């Protein structure tokens, strides 16, 4: 009997004032929340933000919407949301958000007989996350999502995670290319501004960076270029064109890798660990070229000393490079 | 009682003309401003602008909204803002702005018993900032936000910073990697257009650019290449091939560094200080090559004169380079 349902819904929305919160003038209305994380698409060090898609569900009680004589939850067309009160929830650290709207607005309104309202949205949000890159690429970051009431103070509304630590689901399924999610945490607190105290929910993730990409991207290329630079010591000293070609090509490849590295990062004013490693590699290749310059300089009158210097550099440079790698990987691990 | 407040608000909005300002036809209405800065996302020289996010709060008195019998301040659902008069405040130097709308429009309306309205918005705006880059990268910028009334002249409306020096908060939340905030300033004034006089608030920041590693990353390579070009003075003049090779290599390397560097920096169209520095270094290396050309020209008939000219170049060139560096760093610092 759809006519009775229609009459009941018309009666519930008769004289209903959306300008007033539930229990206006009385105790604060308690709003529970939960989130299903569908995906975390892209994490950007350049922009210091991450993108996240989620199903965001809010639960509250509105005694003006209690109905009798129908033993069912009433899932209603989402346009009824424009005729009801909803919480004024927002995200502090977001930079640009939107609700999906294909094929219609991705919104859900479900009434329960006792007056409980379930209000669901599907949201894609970009959120700010300041990153500490002092230990890059061996770093660990903490990215948060802050959820707050905009207009209502703690005397009108209260937030709580509905279900405790089970209120956020789908984190273990998330796959990120450069990162892995070590842990996620849920916090509830109050925040005081000049206009009063407001409830605050925080959802934080701790991300540990995978090293394999950096091994494949900067570490292995640097090692291979350094070995190529060491190939010069085994060519006879009178082949000037070959060894100068080797030196110039290795230096240029070092510069290209370094420029790519610094391109993929923000313009921070301090020295990073990877910067230290890259300038170590540059020092090594420059020293190899200077060694060749010296040998070519002194070899006309002392061929034996030049041969001895080249032969000893054949051993000394790999050993010192190994020591530098040891020191670097021991200071950061 | 919720019905009593409902009918009180219905009586407040009954007979309310949204087309008329408070005290229309009488003394001007005073509007107090407040800004709570959340972040400055980015500062762009190429686009000559910056992105700012803020809570913008407006305070005024509308006698038509006064109510009695309720010793409380009514925090209303923000949709009621579509039924009230609000000031037509705009930002003169903004280029693209939006109000955040997730989960709802980030808007706040608070009424007080005597008729005071507090109206809050969360706004992200990309505002223009004409930067003078003549001293770049050692430059200091001044970026402003201009707040004005569009339609109402000084006869209708007045602006003032609410709280004086404390009207703008959150300046310590501004975290720019490439800049630091030195000072902020608040200004109130009037602006005359052909349609009358309008109130104008102004919020300005002074940005100081951070030098560190990146300043060195450019200026040092040219100096080092110039010194390598000075290495030619100590090599005997019988080595025509070696010295000619040194001069050509240093010159061509200077040209390559300059071209790649300009291909790297932002594409400002005008000439910067660093361009003048690089051109000075180019002039020095070209003069060193010309000096060698002269030495090669005269040394076969006047070797003693050639040796004296080389010895004096040995002394003069480092001295003139030091003078050039001294003058440059005195003028630009």
């Amino acid at each position: 009997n759809m006519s009775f349902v229609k009459e009941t819904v018309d009666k519930l929305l008769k004289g209903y004032d959306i300008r007033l919160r539930p229990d206006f003038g009385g105790p604060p209305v308690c709003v529970g929340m939960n989130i299903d994380i569908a995906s975390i698409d892209m994490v950007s060090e350049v922009n210091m933000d991450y993108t996240l898609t989620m199903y965001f569900q809010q639960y509250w009680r509105d005694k003006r919407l209690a109905y009798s004589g129908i033993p069912l939850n009433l899932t209603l067309d989402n346009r009824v949301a424009d005729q009801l009160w909803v919480p004024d929830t927002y995200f502090l650290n977001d930079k640009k958000s939107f609700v999906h709207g294909v094929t219609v607005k991705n919104r859900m309104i479900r009434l329960h007989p006792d007056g409980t309202v379930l209000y669901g949205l599907r949201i894609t949000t970009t959120a700010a996350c300041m990153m500490d890159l002092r230990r890059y690429p061996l770093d660990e970051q903490n990215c948060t999502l802050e959820i707050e009431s905009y207009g209502y103070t703690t005397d009108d509304i209260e937030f709580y995670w509905r279900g405790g630590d089970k209120a956020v689901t789908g984190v273990e399924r998330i796959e990120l290319p450069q990162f892995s999610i070590v842990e996620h945490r849920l916090v509830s607190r109050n925040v005081v501004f000049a206009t009063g105290a407001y409830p605050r929910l925080s959802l934080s993730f701790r991300l540990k960076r995978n090293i394999g990409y950096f091994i494949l991207q900067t570490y292995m290329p640097s090692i291979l270029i350094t070995i190529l630079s060491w190939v010069s010591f085994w060519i006879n000293y009178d082949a000037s064109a070959a060894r100068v070609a080797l030196g110039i090509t290795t230096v240029l490849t070092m510069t290209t890798i370094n420029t790519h590295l610094r391109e993929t990062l923000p313009k921070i004013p301090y020295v990073k660990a990877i910067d230290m490693y890259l300038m170590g590699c540059f020092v090594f290749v420059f020293l190899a070229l200077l060694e060749y310059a010296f040998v070519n300089y002194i070899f006309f009158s002392q061929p034996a000393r030049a041969a001895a210097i080249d032969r000893w550099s054949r051993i000394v440079f790999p050993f010192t490079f190994s020591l530098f790698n040891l020191v670097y990987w021991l200071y950061y691990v | 009682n919720m019905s009593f407040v409902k009918e009180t608000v219905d009586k407040l909005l009954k007979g309310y003309d949204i087309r008329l300002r408070p005290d229309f036809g009488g003394p001007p209405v005073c509007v107090g401003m407040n800004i709570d800065i959340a972040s400055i996302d980015m500062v762009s020289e190429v686009n000559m602008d910056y992105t700012l996010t803020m809570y913008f709060q407006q305070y005024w008195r509308d006698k038509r909204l006064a109510y009695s019998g309720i010793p409380l301040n009514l925090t209303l659902d923000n949709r009621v803002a579509d039924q009230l008069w609000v000031p037509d405040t705009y930002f003169l130097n903004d280029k693209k702005s939006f109000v955040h709308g997730v989960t709802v429009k980030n808007r706040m309306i608070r009424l007080h018993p005597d008729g005071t309205v507090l109206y809050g918005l969360r706004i992200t705006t990309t505002a223009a900032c004409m930067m003078d880059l003549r001293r770049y990268p050692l430059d200091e910028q001044n970026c402003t936000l201009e707040i004005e009334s569009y339609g109402y002249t000084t006869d209708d409306i007045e602006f003032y910073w609410r709280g004086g020096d404390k009207a703008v908060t959150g300046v310590e939340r501004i975290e720019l990697p490439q800049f630091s905030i030195v000072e902020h300033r608040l200004v109130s004034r009037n602006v005359v257009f052909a349609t009358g006089a309008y109130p104008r608030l102004s919020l300005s920041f002074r940005l100081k650019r951070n030098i560190g590693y990146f300043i060195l990353q450019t200026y040092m390579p040219s100096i080092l290449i110039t010194i390598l070009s000075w290495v030619s003075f100590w090599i005997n003049y019988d080595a025509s091939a070696a010295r000619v090779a040194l001069g050509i290599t240093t010159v061509l390397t200077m040209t390559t560094i300059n071209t790649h560097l300009r291909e790297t920096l932002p594409k400002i169209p005008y000439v910067k200080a660093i361009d003048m520095y690089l051109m000075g270094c180019f002039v020095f290396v070209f003069l060193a090559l010309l000096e060698y050309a002269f030495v090669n020209y005269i040394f076969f008939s006047q070797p003693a004169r050639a040796a004296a000219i080389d010895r004096w170049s040995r002394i003069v060139f480092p001295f003139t380079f030091s003078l050039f560096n001294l003058v440059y760093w005195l003028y630009y610092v």
Epitope: D132, N142, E146, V191 | E172, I174, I181
Partner: nanobody
């Protein structure tokens, strides 16, 4: 006189340090705040032009130099850390990690 607050651990997640003082009969009162990186100080009215705050990241320390003292400056002093999105700068509730109390007469 000069008070030093040295912080260790996750100083990146708490980029702001603040100073408070507690009177024998009154609640905690904000004195000043300093940013770890920006070095942008903020002061209460009662200690403007008199107290100064400086920061050094070498050993993660913040110094409060007190000059031109007065007998109305006899309160137990505390140092605290504030989160990145913790709200207003003048409210003790928004500060998580509090140091040990220090007495001044």
């Amino acid at each position: 006189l000069r008070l030093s607050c040295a912080a260790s651990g996750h100083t990146f997640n708490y980029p702001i340090m603040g100073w408070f003082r507690q009177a024998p009969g009154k609640e905690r009162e904000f004195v000043g705040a300093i940013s770890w990186s920006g070095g942008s100080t903020s002061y209460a009215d009662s200690v403007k032009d008199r107290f100064t705050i400086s920061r050094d990241n070498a050993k993660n320390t913040v110094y409060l130099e007190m000059n031109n003292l007065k007998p109305e400056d006899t309160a137990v002093y505390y140092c605290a850390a504030k989160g990145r999105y913790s709200g207003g700068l003048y409210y003790p509730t928004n500060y998580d990690y509090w140091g040990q109390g220090t007495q001044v007469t």
